[PDB]
Design a protein around this nucleic acid. Structure first.
Ligand SMILES: Nc1nc2c(ncn2[C@H]2C[C@H](O)[C@@H](COP(=O)(O)OP(=O)(O)OP(=O)(O)O)O2)c(=O)[nH]1
Ligand SMILES: [Mg+2]
Lengths: 553, 406
DNA sequence: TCGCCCCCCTTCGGTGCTTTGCACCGAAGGGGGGC
């Protein structure tokens, strides 16, 4: 049945007209599936015949359903969507089972053909013109237009979600004691009422939906656990993800590996410790989805580790609002982090991972800060509050970081947890110069046209060095000059540069970098005992910097 | 009453900014506030066929523990026509920064008695999110002059003049300046005396529909040079790089006879005695930094820019300029709550204070260059915001070379 | 041979700097999952 809800006015983008795209060929089985739907759609008032006055057209096809025997109708509105007005999408996110509370009575309902029960603005309908082919030349196609929301049109999801919200709003206001998760046409309905009253409220909800033309077939009406919902399985006390089958291949293509990494990210919401860094590295620098990529040894190990984790059975629990949320993070190496969110020990609400490389140069403390931020935002989305943190970093380490780093930074209430490897600063620059330590005046210069440069130093102990450099840049030569001072100095050194750039990188205490040269400098800094690093303006005649800048000529 | 025709600037379209996540208590407050505003016809429920959106959140001051809805119309305001171009802007009075106490009043509710151009309402849409995305977002648009839209003080300008006339009539030496939804009201009366006439202005306003600032204490902090009795090579290198930087700000400052006290490849900790020709150069340079710069004047046709640096132990230095190195004002903001633990809270409060000073001094807020990662700021800043306005800002990562301002 | 949403990983291209590459950032490609 078509809703007596009022149509939402919709327009094309200014200046544009409608689509005009000829129909293509389809199989015998799909044309009769569509003809069954189409003449039934016409008799249910979902579509109407048109003719040649309407000059628009758009091709149509069909795909089969997870329900093995039903067919899904789709019209290729790619062109009409481009010319259709923008919408502000009302689906802001995806509900998560870890955000659910325990309920005594639970129901999952689905509205059938919800799109086809929502009417389409009458002035817009003529732009949805299409044509059903029936083989090749036996006839030209019959022409229809949509009277309801079509599958494949840009605005159909938003107009269904908005209409569903309007229809449900009376019933939500009347029953605040009943939680209704509303995803597209899928309704999760939980209550603390005994099953008798609960089922009264369901039939009441169903009758309210049907007055507005939304049918709810018993085929899609779950009343017993485990409920299938949003890809999960809802038990009374716990939830599981529906089974995750990983690809297993002798030969791997780029596209195979992309599928694998996606499955593992999805698994990581409840399977603790998933890693995808080595498998994802195999996608770098590739140039075709069908290009065969051999697994490195590191990626095999990572895959095997994930496979061990995924054969263990896991479950999440539900949210108890009268207890704190606790978030614990572990370091996995190579910029990878994993976390669990729980309220009572060894009963995770969910898990996750953070593994993004932000910036060319960074350190573990920054990345831990980023993990905390990802977790804080996720907890706001799911539970409306941030959790208490348990972090493998000492209070001394953090305090040393936010007092010697020039940007404002913070972490909310957190408790140290001793789960090695701990997050630590891998070196610290001295705030004052070091008595008795050598003083290096470093400098490097390159020529823009040349690819050519020099890096070198002078020393208060009389030491000097210059090395030629090829295919370099101005900034590289300065990093190189610092590289050699660290290379040729003892455990304690004083260094003076005129590169704001280099001082900028090194003062932020990075422990990893996308640049191999910066990585080499980091290794040298970690091996040192004390390092004071000072800056002076270039080309101003300053002793030390003067002589080395002369020398690099 | 009939509406004023409003348009966006030529070639620009309405705002399209996504709603960010909100805590449970902020979502509840917005649902309570918007449900009542919809009943009173100030806003109307809309659907997704309106393609525009502006983020909404809520703030709660602790000397008024009721939630205040705040819509971030910064994008919409940038795209709205100027009212200085069509004869409606509010002139700023030079006398306000002279007053010894200035109280800020939130008068945003007065705008809700004037309707908004029917064809402009669509640009004001916002969306309330849902915990764990239980439902789609819920959308509204304004039917009246919104709080936080720069067109509301301009359209309401005629009316607020008539409402205020008797008060300014009876108090010729109290200065009142309207900035957005705020009245900045300053006087020279004693602390509790001033608070009393604030309450009188409040009641006259009710007839139809924060804490004390002190501008005569907004000390300017200049570039200072250290004073020691023994000077290292590193000390004089630190000194010379600082003066070389200040030679782009001040006039006639030299380093020639400090620069070659450092002649030779010297050790960073070797003490170098100061020549009489060096003490001559240094005590000279310190007096130039003593009293400030000649030729620096405010230009109302150009934007204000603010830079902030974290110094440590709760201290934050700042500079306000329109042209690089021609600072209208330099200052230092100091700690408050006493733990001094939270950098993001301190920076957020520093921004409110610096922007407040700009409003009182020049009548508008500066664009801020914030020494913080974008995602760190966005994770936490709304938890500490207490103003009904929001300045423009951007995120910079500039390491210090000198500590010029310390 | 379709639509809308969230997530992650990689690649690309626009912006601004007292630059000449570099670092940052948003958008778009691929993948997962939902209806
Ligand atoms: N355009 C498009 N929409 C889909 C697709 N899958 C699901 N949906 C949309 C259209 C459907 O009306 C709605 C829900 O689909 P469902 O599989 O839950 O049921 P459907 O309406 O297709 O038929 P049914 O409820 O089983 O009678 O979301 C798809 O592949 N393409
Ligand atoms: Mg359906």
């Amino acid at each position: 049945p078509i809703s007596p809800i009022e149509t939402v006015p919709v327009k094309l983008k200014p200046g544009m007209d409608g689509p005009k795209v000829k129909q293509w060929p389809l199989t015998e089985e799909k044309i009769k599936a569509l003809v069954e739907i189409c003449t039934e759609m016409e008799k249910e008032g979902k579509i109407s015949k048109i003719g040649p006055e309407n000059p628009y057209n758009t091709p149509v096809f069909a795909i089969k359903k997870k329900d093995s025997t039903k067919w899904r109708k789709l019209v290729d509105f790619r062109e009409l969507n481009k010319r259709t007005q923008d919408f502000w999408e009302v689906q802001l996110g995806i509900p998560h089972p870890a955000g659910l509370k325990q309920k005594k009575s639970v129901t999952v309902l689905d509205v059938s053909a919800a799109f086809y029960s929502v009417p389409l603005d009458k002035d817009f309908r003529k732009y949805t013109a299409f044509t059903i082919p029936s083989i090749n030349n036996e006839t030209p196609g019959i022409r229809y237009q949509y009277n309801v929301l079509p599958m494949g049109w840009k605005g159909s999801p938003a107009l269904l979600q908005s209409s569903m919200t309007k229809i449900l709003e009376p019933f939500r206001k009347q029953n605040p004691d009943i939680v209704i998760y509303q995803y597209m046409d899928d309704l999760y309905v939980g209550s603390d009422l005994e099953i008798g009253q609960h089922r009264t409220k369901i039939e009441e909800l169903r009758q309210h939906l049907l007055r507005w033309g939304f049918t709810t077939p018993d085929k899609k009406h779950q009343k017993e656990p485990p409920f299938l919902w949003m890809g999960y399985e809802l038990h009374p006390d716990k939830w599981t993800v529906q089974p995750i089958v990983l690809p297993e291949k002798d030969s791997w293509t780029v596209n195979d590996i992309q599928k694998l990494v996606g499955k593992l990210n999805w698994a990581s919401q409840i399977y603790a410790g998933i890693k995808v860094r080595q498998l994802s590295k195999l996608l770098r620098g590739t140039k075709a989805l069908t290009e065969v990529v051999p697994l490195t040894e590191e990626a095999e190990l990572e895959l095997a580790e994930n496979r061990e984790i995924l054969k263990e059975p896991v479950h999440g629990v539900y949210y108890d609002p009268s207890k704190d949320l606790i978030a614990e993070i572990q370091k996995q190496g190579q910029g990878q982090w994993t976390y669990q969110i729980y309220q009572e020990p060894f009963k995770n609400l969910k898990t996750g991972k953070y593994a993004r490389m932000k910036g060319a140069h960074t350190n573990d403390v920054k990345q831990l800060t980023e993990a905390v931020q990802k977790i804080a935002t996720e907890s706001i989305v799911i539970w409306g509050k941030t959790p208490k943190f348990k972090l493998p970093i000492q209070k001394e380490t953090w305090e040393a970081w936010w007092t010697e780093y020039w940007q404002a930074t913070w972490i909310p209430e957190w408790e140290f947890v001793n789960t090695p490897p701990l997050v630590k600063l891998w070196y610290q620059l001295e705030k004052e110069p070091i008595i008795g330590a050598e003083t290096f005046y470093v400098d490097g210069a390159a020529n823009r046209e040349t690819k050519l440069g020099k890096a070198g130093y002078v020393t208060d102990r009389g030491r000097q060095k210059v090395v030629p450099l090829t295919d370099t840049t101005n900034q590289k030569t300065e990093l190189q000059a610092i590289h050699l001072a660290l290379q040729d100095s003892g455990l304690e050194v004083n260094i003076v540069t005129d590169s704001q750039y280099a001082l900028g990188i090194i003062q932020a205490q990075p422990d990893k970098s996308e640049s191999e040269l910066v990585s080499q400098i980091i290794e040298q800094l970690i091996k040192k005992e004390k390092v004071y690093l000072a800056w002076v303006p270039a080309h101003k005649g300053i002793g030390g910097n003067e002589q080395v800048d002369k020398l690099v000529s | 009453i009939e509406t004023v025709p409003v348009k966006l600037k030529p070639g620009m379209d309405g705002p399209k900014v996504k709603q960010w996540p909100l805590t449970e208590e902020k979502i509840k407050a917005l649902v309570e506030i918007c449900t009542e505003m919809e009943k009173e016809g100030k806003i109307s429920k809309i659907g997704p066929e309106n393609p525009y959106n502006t983020p909404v959140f809520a703030i709660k001051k602790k000397d008024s523990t009721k939630w205040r809805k705040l819509v971030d119309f910064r994008e919409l305001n940038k795209r709205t026509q100027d009212f200085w171009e069509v004869q409606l802007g509010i002139p700023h009075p030079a006398g306000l920064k002279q007053k010894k106490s200035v109280t800020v009043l939130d008068v945003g509710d007065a705008y809700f008695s004037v309707p908004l151009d029917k064809d402009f309402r669509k640009y004001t849409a916002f969306t309330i999110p849902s915990i764990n995305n239980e439902t789609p977002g819920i959308r509204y648009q304004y039917n009246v002059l919104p709080q936080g839209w720069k067109g509301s003080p301009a359209i309401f300008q005629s009316s607020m003049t008539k409402i205020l006339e008797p008060f300014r009539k009876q108090n010729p030496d109290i200065v009142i300046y309207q900035y957005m939804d705020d009245l900045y009201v300053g006087s020279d009366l004693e602390i509790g005396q001033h608070r009393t006439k604030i309450e009188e202005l409040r009641q006259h306003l009710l007839r139809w529909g924060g804490y004390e600032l002190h501008p005569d204490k907004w000390t300017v902090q200049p570039i200072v040079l250290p004073e020691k009795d023994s000077w290292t090579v590193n000390d004089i290198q630190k000194l010379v790089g600082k003066l070389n930087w200040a030679s782009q700000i001040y006039a006639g400052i030299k380093v020639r006879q400090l620069s070659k006290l450092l002649r030779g490849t010297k050790a960073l900790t070797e003490v170098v005695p100061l020549t009489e020709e060096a003490e001559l150069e240094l005590a000279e340079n310190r007096e130039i930094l003593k009293e400030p710069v000649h030729g620096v004047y405010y230009d109302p046709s150009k934007d204000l820019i603010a830079e902030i640096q974290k110094q440590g132990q709760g201290q934050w230095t700042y500079q306000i300029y329109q042209e690089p190195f021609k600072n209208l004002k330099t200052g230092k903001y100091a700690r408050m709550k006493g733990a001094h633990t939270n950098d993001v809270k301190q920076l957020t409060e520093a921004v409110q204070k610096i922007a407040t000073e700009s409003i009182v001094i020049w009548g508008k807020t500066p664009k801020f260059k914030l020494p913080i990662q974008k995602e760190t700021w966005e994770a936490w800043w709304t938890e500490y915001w207490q103003a009904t306005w929001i300045p423009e800002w951007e995120f910079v990562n500039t390491p210090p070379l000198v500590k010029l301002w310390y």
